[PDB]
Amino acid sequence: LNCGQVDSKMKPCLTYVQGGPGPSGECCNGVRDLHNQAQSSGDRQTVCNCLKGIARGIHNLNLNNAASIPSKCNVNVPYTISPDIDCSRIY
């Protein structure tokens, strides 16, 4: 699947979306990586669901940093590495 890769690349984005400093560029290119991997909704599930669990394991995740991954890489994904995105509605 992809939840495994997505996790390995969305777990390092934690220091940014939560640490504060970042992103390192590879973060937005990582979520964009999902963009090239998942093609249909059933494909995001692994991805989105991943960023969900991962993003949902930090002391105080920051939505601002986790809300600019797409606004920066211009990917336009529906979900993000956060404890609140929505995979049931991945368009």
- Each domain of the chain, given as residue ranges in start order, spans 1-91
Instruction: Return the number of other C-beta atoms located less than 10 Å from residue 75's C-beta.
Output: 17
What separation in angstroms does the CA of 79 have from each of 44, 63, 64? 9, 12, 14
Buried b or exposed e, range 15-48, using 16+ CB within 10 angstroms: bbbbeeebbeebbbbbbbbbbeebeeeeebbbbb
CATH of 1-91 given 3.30.70.100, 3.50.90.10, 3.40.1080.10, 1.10.110.10: 1.10.110.10
User: Could you give the 3-state DSSP secondary structure of residue 71?
Assistant: helix
Asked how this structure was determined, the answer is NMR
* Residue in this structure with the two tokens 């692994």, named with its chain if needed: 46
* CA separation for the pair 41, 58 (Å, rounded): 26
